[PDB]
Enzyme design. Structure first.
Site, PDB file in Angstrom:
ATOM      1  N   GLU A   1       0.806  -1.144   0.035  1.00  0.00           N
ATOM      2  CA  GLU A   1       0.079   0.000   0.028  1.00  0.00           C
ATOM      3  C   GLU A   1       0.846   1.229   0.107  1.00  0.00           C
ATOM      4  OE1 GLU A   1      -2.806  -0.031   3.079  1.00  0.00           O
ATOM      5  OE2 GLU A   1      -3.823  -1.913   2.395  1.00  0.00           O
TER       6      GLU A   1
ATOM      7  N   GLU B   1      -4.891  -8.775   0.883  1.00  0.00           N
ATOM      8  CA  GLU B   1      -5.813  -8.412   1.899  1.00  0.00           C
ATOM      9  C   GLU B   1      -7.296  -8.219   1.428  1.00  0.00           C
ATOM     10  OE1 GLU B   1      -4.521  -5.119   4.382  1.00  0.00           O
ATOM     11  OE2 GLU B   1      -2.462  -5.912   3.895  1.00  0.00           O
TER      12      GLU B   1
END
Lengths: 442, 444, 444, 442
Positions: free
Chosen positions: D162, D350
């Site tokens: 991220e 995720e």
């Protein structure tokens, strides 16, 4: 240099730049009449009061055009002659254009007619001009009477001439009438021009049920990065968006380029002046696409510029406007348009050059202007060999004329004009162009 | 004028000296800028200029014949430190000789340390954008002080940081030609801090009483109309040209209205460190003003700084600049009301006109008239108590006028740049006579 | 406190009245904003509120039992002009009765004209962004003056134009919930000009001597550190919250540092017409201040206005607001040094805490302590000559707290919104006793 | 719900969120250790000092993972354990990860290893952190020793987790460590993350000559316009550029989106921190593409916002983070990626949800978390029926853990953790997930 038998040769002018008779025939002032009178705006306060006196001398100019042998004469209609006050049609003004176009047909010359070439009536300006969405309706009433009275004798229609100039140069950079420096006004002005274009096209083809060819004219200046740096790539992108894509995308894709909407959002914080359906109308299908082409621009990045670019040093040969002579870039442009934008037939509705013309023993040996035109005609021919479908080329200009903020200080004509006496003297480029057309006809 | 009023004339190193690669001199940012395409009129440069490095004795005699009390000149930093940390005695010797010779002729040397010729070695390390530029300048000033303080009448630390800073790093018109507002505020800051530190060094460390000050170009700004938009426009033009420089020097702060406006580009001001503004505002002996003109301005919604030039109906010089002696008076009165009681020297004032050499003469009645009007204004201001201690006429010689090259002539002495011949223009004869007339009015 | 110091308590129309569609009342911007998804806590609204339009007599008795000298309330514009140009006598009759009844009980009515309930009809024509809002307000104020001036003790034109203007049109948190800086500066301007015009009308046309003034919420701003960046941050927070409003009212001008900063969004200021600022700054009889807290701020390079909230270690209210009585004192001293000598009324001060009803009582010692500290500060300021003529405790009743709905309780009287029962909190008993104690100190 | 025999089920964690032992084994503080200690930044000054004590209790957690029957365990390596000072390798730190991965292989569980999951060493921060182009080299020295010591026992590598969070949320919006609010720092930070990704990939495949699968993980949040207005279209565009295209374009197209470069030029006035070759390296070919997906965002226009958008009201069901539950939008995203960006195999590295978990009589009846996961697995299955080639799904998280600025106040685990006692208690979602995997295996 070989052109299809179908190829049309042309030459071009606009109403305010040649007509004169500024307060005759019921004509009221345009934004340019008053701009010329505003201190600092036009070279030596030159104006179009007399110009080339073409309103009076149109018969002689028709003969010049005849003698050239051009297939096409591109001219504009003065809005302030047709609606000198709001809602008040002026038959005397329409008669001059009816006569002009009838006479051209009689001589076997196609009239290519520009509706808006920059001479917005002062009454329209007084209500906010092109910034006001009502400008779209004002324009439609002008277009409507033009179509009513002229569609039968006109060969083609051009709705607008260079909305980059009439929009951005006029309302953002303040160099052209009305001389404002307001980015919000500018994008509203452009939008209303483009929407007025689309609506006039729909009117012509729907309610007039006419098949007369119609399109828009854009000036396009292809942009080049000084280096291969990422910064200079951004700069080229943004110069290209500002000059070209801001107009090409609405007209052909029915969208504004979001990269430019974001960059313009340093000044323009809402885009709700673009109503649902506007872009669909702006992109209404047309018969041809008009291109005014003069040059390229080499640009580079500037951290201190709102739009991230500034002009870079050019080592090219230049005209007497200081503009690059750029035929290879002209070819880059046309290829791009076919790769990215349109398959419509293209007319080069303007191409030409100003040079420091010298009158000696009644002649003008403008070899420089000849070399300029020759390169671009050559480029058209070569492009047409690649299948680029350039249907015609109109040389700017028939006559030396009022060159906007430069006044009479810049001469684009193939025919010289003494502005004191009104004498027309063919330059060598006129004799050469006449001959080029004749050679093509064999 | 008062019995202790001084008449002067002015030049700078790069605009007149020539001998650009002699005597140990290495290139400045102007040498390379002149060679960069599109930056300077016809790529003119200062390689030869007025060839003053060689012809200084002739020019001294010209200065002597003019009768001026003061000759203002600058020291070429690239002659003194042609490389970082490497002092050049041959370069210093030229200035030591020049000043000694001026003294021997009874002429006061008013000496500008920085008149725009930053060494390329400094530029290659970030130039004025680098805070180390303060120390580089200090080393330059230190040796000038060591070697010349006994021989100079006054020191000027910096000439026109608006030009060296904003015109050079923001508008890209002067060397090094950048267009980056963050570089430009950092550049200006370091120039002003360098001034402060040089004054502290002279008065603290050298314990010298030689008069010292800074020279700002100041251009009073007027609104086209009385609309609030045009008032905002004038405010921002005045902040950009004048207050950005006056406030730190005299008030010890930068104007927050302009910090806010500049934050369209400058998103941090942590380049201003504790102590900087106290040093920038260290007390000086005089204040130098370069004055040429006003600007009339109006509002523009499409301008980052909310203003653009408005049409002017004033008579103009060959630069297109307004001839504006009344506005010069508003300026000087304003400075006394709002900023300083220090004595003022007009360290430059003058004009470019299209001079025509005819039968060995230059009939520049236009330049005479320009100068007469400003001298009259000085005199008038002095009757009001405005304490203008001197006037230095820009320039002694026609010279290299920056991005305009040799195309613009500000001299009272004409220079034929093919031959280096000096020819006194009518204005030089007239100025000499004006000084005589003033001397003849004083009781001997 | 001095013998002529006044103790008060305060409400506004929409936060307490209810009867939202009765008596001719048409919707305000808050009615519709409460119904807009995501704008108000659980879509709570003012349909019923405290049902004060019906229960006013009960509330008068509560006010009487508190012993306050003054009751501050507002007039619902949508009760008076439920449509443009159409006056509603039934709406006016409620306020005429209310004020008459207060007078009959020896209570001074302090009356707010605009406390945020713009009629929807006005909103549908552009609201405060439209310059015609000045005339719409004027017509509202005119009839209030015609019908009530004889019966009211003082007038307050506007309550918190920072909220009605910036919080409503810039930050979108209050009705009508826009986020447009150009709308917001136009809105504020028209509110301030409407104030000026109303004061001119009262004093000129009505020839009335009734005390009149404006109420601003003021939030003193402090820098987290002494870095120049944090000083710029405090400057801009203070400009945005306070000076944008104080300068026009007291100096007849807008601060140019903030005009420049706002020009990231606002590219013309021609909505400010000749005469506007002279009218905005027309002389008033008092100055009203709503004070709740300070803000500690620091710099942010990524913020348009160069500042963001900094961490605070102060004790806080149930709103998360700092409890900041020392900063209240800095504020009042600053106003006397920089802006005005007018008498000051604290037209609001108070706090929200998480009140618990237990065995018919509300033990709000936290609210008591909050109020005690500010009353002590007022007293102290008055010993310094700071001329605070009164203090109005926000609020009489728990009520509709705007975007927080009924989730935040500022009342000294608890309100069970299911039953409309009023229950005096400990703070109400204590406040009544504080007023008694002050009265018992005066010689009768 | 049918998955190919090839499909991998996974569960995921990161080092700082679970490990604890913050000052043991030679570990020096990360930017998050000090951020937790900065007033106002993290819920109740919670930190990762102890967390889930996984450094000590890793054997037990391996058993939990074994009992789940997941094919894959995704975890991260703590940079401050490996290089606790600059240039000073720490064998004790590497031993823990060597043991961890050896033990997982012994139990037949694929280790999916994240190199950078946000725990930048304080020594790196002290030199300018990710804003400094030297961060690329610091990262390569970390990656290099990881590859030297672990490539043989690791099943796949993920370079970065991220970068929108580590870049923009951390250096622009100031919500994550180091908490800065500077758009120039942010774009430099992102750029250096992405370039460090590309260089580590080249290192692995060139000089290590390793075929271990490697890719980046991006969080992607698809964006939707509240209305069809042009303003709201711009707003969606810019929300999408800021969250997604700013990362997708460099990685897959080797370019930054010029529309966002223009919008960011309200703060960022030069882009010369992007050097020649950087984008070619950022876009170096990878084996798979990692997606963290949690939700969508509905947005609308704001004239007062620099980036022209703000969140709009959502009427969807929401998790205990307040985030929309948005499986249809998850499917829009994946289709788009295949239409516009890549054909690589996708791993959902995720997906998961925080809900207000209630412990009653030793159980957690987290039907809400079950419903969330079930919808997204369903969506994966359906997408795989369209040929969208989602190779695997890792459920965030194995354990309740330190949820960044929310501290321990938000529980994403399928296994509950008492943070006082360190007891692990399987929630109903753990039992359900274990069973879903077993059913797939038949």
């Amino acid at each position: 240099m070989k052109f299809a038998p179908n190829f049309v040769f042309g030459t071009a002018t606009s109403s305010y730049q040649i007509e004169g008779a500024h307060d005759e025939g019921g004509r009221t002032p345009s934004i340019w009449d008053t701009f010329c009178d505003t201190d600092g705006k036009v070279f030596e306060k030159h104006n179009g009061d007399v110009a080339c006196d073409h309103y009076h001398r149109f018969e002689e100019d028709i003969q010049h055009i005849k003698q050239l042998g051009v297939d096409t004469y591109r001219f504009s209609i003065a809005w302030p002659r047709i609606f000198p006050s709001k809602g008040q049609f002026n038959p005397e003004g329409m008669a001059f254009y009816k006569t002009l176009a009838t006479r051209l047909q009689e001589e076997g010359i196609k009239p290519a007619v520009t509706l808006y070439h920059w001479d917005l009536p002062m009454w329209a300006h007084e209500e906010g001009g092109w910034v006001n969405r009502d400008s779209v309706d004002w324009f439609l009433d002008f277009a409507r009477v033009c179509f009513e009275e002229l569609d039968g004798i006109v060969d083609s229609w051009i709705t607008h001439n260079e909305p980059w100039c009439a929009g951005f140069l006029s309302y953002h950079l303040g160099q052209h009438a009305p001389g404002h420096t307001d980015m919000n006004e500018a994008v509203r002005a452009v939008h209303h021009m483009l929407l007025s274009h689309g609506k006039a096209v729909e009117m012509l083809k729907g309610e007039f049920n006419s098949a007369t060819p119609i399109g828009i004219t854009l000036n396009l200046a292809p942009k080049y990065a000084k280096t291969d740096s990422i910064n200079d790539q951004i700069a080229m992108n943004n110069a290209d968006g500002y000059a070209n894509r801001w107009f090409l995308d609405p007209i052909f894709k029915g969208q504004y380029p979001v990269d430019m909407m974001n960059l313009f959002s340093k000044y323009v914080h809402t885009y709700d002046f673009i109503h649902a359906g506007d872009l669909a109308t702006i992109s209404t299908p047309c018969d041809f696409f008009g291109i005014n082409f003069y040059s390229r621009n080499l640009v580079e990045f500037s951290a201190a510029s709102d739009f991230l670019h500034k002009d870079a040093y050019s080592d090219y040969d230049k005209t007497g406007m200081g503009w690059d002579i750029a035929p290879s870039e002209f070819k880059d442009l046309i290829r791009r348009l076919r790769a990215e934008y349109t398959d419509l037939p293209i007319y080069i509705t303007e191409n030409g050059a100003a040079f420091d013309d010298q009158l000696v023993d009644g002649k003008i040996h403008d070899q420089n202007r000849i070399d300029y035109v020759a390169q671009h005609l050559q480029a058209v021919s070569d492009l047409n060999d690649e299948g680029m479908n350039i249907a015609g080329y109109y040389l700017w200009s028939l006559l030396d004329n009022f060159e906007w903020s430069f006044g009479y200080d810049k001469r684009f004509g193939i025919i010289y004009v003494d502005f004191d006496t009104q004498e027309r003297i063919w330059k060598d480029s006129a004799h050469w162009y006449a001959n080029v057309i004749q050679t093509h006809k064999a």
